[PDB]
Write a protein that binds this ligand. Structure first.
Ligand SMILES: [Mg+2]
Ligand SMILES: [Mg+2]
Ligand SMILES: [Mg+2]
Ligand SMILES: [Mg+2]
Lengths: 350, 346
């Protein structure tokens, strides 16, 4: 006899058909396991599209996890990240060619294009174009830091509240969303972990994972330390409290704050020099100021100095060496750094 | 008292200075830890240039190991891979911007640009442009497969003889080098291992590592199995014989042969379908032909069928389930598939 065979099964999102998507050649970047492209949906909606790299082991499983975490975030933390528009899976005969503007065979994810800009690119162009894109009235390092950090820390707090650790917080993964008033949104949940069993943990394991070394403390490249049990449904809440994987995002948010606050730390080399000196004085911001800051004459720490050194203090909170001492992103939101000045805005108030 | 500063040390190749190199924008594809660009050396030499990704863990260390393996290959296996032109390392003040045509801070490796093609791109355009780029007179699936596989297996044999396992053999990592008669050259020693102590092994350890899932047996993503001793200068020869890490490249070379021989296997989905059926019939090419090949009505296996099924038999040897049964690339190169025609009547 002969085997009968059968249909193919393809994953789809209601209302999203491959025929309605045009893909533009030119990766908006390859990351570790996937490739992002710009595209146009239904002729007039700017979107971003991601598929797996064919050459990377388990890239399909990593893209599936990114998909699952995006559905979780869409359900539980709307507005924290680029708006998720679902998936499109294309088969072999119906799969197209990027150069023809058509989606190729395999699984695709789609998001709204929240803006042409990243915070990395804007901050390097200058504080002025960054402030304009953020609709930030106080167009100073202090002003943009206060606004951006309040938005970033509030979004991280909402992600953490629903069990998600982003894992790749950095200026390149923020967009000032022009169509939502300039507010910052995160992109790229490709390394994110779902750390509570809601209903199962996702991408969450003991030991080192992918980490951008620029935005991760050199000896904490993990969410759960090697010593840790494997996460299961029964222990997840205990591990959360004991190992504080959310504090990985706190350290990265402190890096973002340093770069927003200090023009000279916006290059990779500037942040790298600062963090080496920070480590060398025992991750002690006051020791940095007392011992090292005098070496940084090309830079201007005014934003961190302002108001009794509030910004230095918040950086210290987000960047404590020990996770057990390091602020949660929710706690960090209450910091004096975010206070209104006495009588702020008096001169035009009713 | 303040700690004193001191010099920065930079790596340099004799004859290669910063002024000599212009980079062009556009990755010939970022890989797992680095980015490759086109460039121009000394005004008129086309080169390719690779640096470490700033966002990847250990990227500079991975690039350093790729550099070491490139020097080993350059000394011991000339012609197997894109010609290695050394390195250039830039510091922070003295580095530029890619968009401005200047190398940025860090270590860079440099190779000759062996050609604008890859075998993956050519084979998907068709057998005809592939055969033209290869200067292959017999412009058929059987003709290109014979010429490409003789060149690939001969280069892999020479790499293995000097202790190097490439670990990323596939059509996308082969170039038909027009300036050298169209001969195939390998690129991308980024995951290669040096498996002999010369003076030490490099990128060689027990357990899984980076692999392209299309070109690695799904349950053999390692060079040394998870249970193996860590390699040392004293056990490396015993481990080579016991675990046959070079047979990783043999399997990948079998996958290359299937794609060159059978047009329908040139897409990712086509080769994936074949391999899933090959596994389902116990990695047995004769069982695939009897039980499965009827399902592949849109494909033409004539190149593998030709001459008593010589191509099928060579694929079977390169793609045995067990490493201890799987041919070495040197042994494969002696196969009847490669024999000259008898009695040609010139
Ligand atoms: Mg695929
Ligand atoms: Mg599938
Ligand atoms: Mg990322
Ligand atoms: Mg590779």
């Amino acid at each position: 006899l002969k085997a009968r065979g059968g249909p193919k099964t393809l994953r789809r999102t209601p209302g999203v058909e491959p025929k309605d998507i045009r893909v533009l050649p030119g990766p908006l970047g390859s990351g570790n396991f996937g490739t992002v492209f710009r595209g146009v949906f239904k002729g007039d909606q700017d979107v971003v599209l991601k598929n797996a790299k064919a050459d990377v082991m388990a890239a399909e499983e990593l893209l599936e996890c990114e998909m699952d975490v995006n559905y979780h975030v869409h359900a539980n933390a709307k507005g924290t990240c680029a708006r998720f528009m679902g998936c499109i899976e294309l088969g072999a005969k119906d799969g197209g060619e990027i150069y023809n503007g058509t989606l190729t065979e395999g699984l695709w994810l789609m998001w709204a294009n929240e803006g042409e800009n990243t915070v990395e690119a804007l901050m390097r162009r200058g504080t002025a174009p960054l402030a304009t894109a953020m609709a930030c009235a106080d167009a100073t390092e202090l002003g943009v830091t206060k606004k951006a950090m309040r938005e970033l820390l509030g979004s991280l707090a909402r992600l953490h509240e629903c069990g998600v650790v982003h894992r790749d917080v950095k200026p390149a993964n923020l967009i000032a969303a022009e169509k939502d008033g300039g507010v910052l949104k995160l992109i790229d949940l490709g390394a994110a972990a779902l750390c509570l069993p809601l209903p199962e943990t996702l991408n969450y394991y003991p030991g080192d994972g992918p980490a951008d070394p620029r935005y991760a403390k050199a000896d904490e490249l993990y969410l759960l330390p090697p010593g840790s049990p494997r996460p299961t449904k029964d222990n997840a809440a205990k591990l959360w409290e004991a190992h504080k994987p959310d504090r990985f995002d706190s350290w990265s948010a402190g890096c973002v704050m340093l770069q927003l606050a200090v023009v000279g730390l916006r290059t990779d080399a500037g942040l790298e020099r600062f963090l080496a000196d920070y480590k060398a004085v025992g991750y002690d911001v006051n020791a940095f100021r007392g011992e090292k800051s005098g070496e940084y004459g090309t830079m201007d720490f005014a934003a961190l100095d302002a108001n009794g050194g509030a910004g230095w203090d918040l950086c210290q909170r987000l960047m404590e060496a020990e996770r057990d001492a390091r602020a949660s992103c929710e706690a960090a939101l209450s910091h004096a750094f975010f206070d209104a000045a006495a009588l702020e805005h008096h001169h035009h108030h009713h």
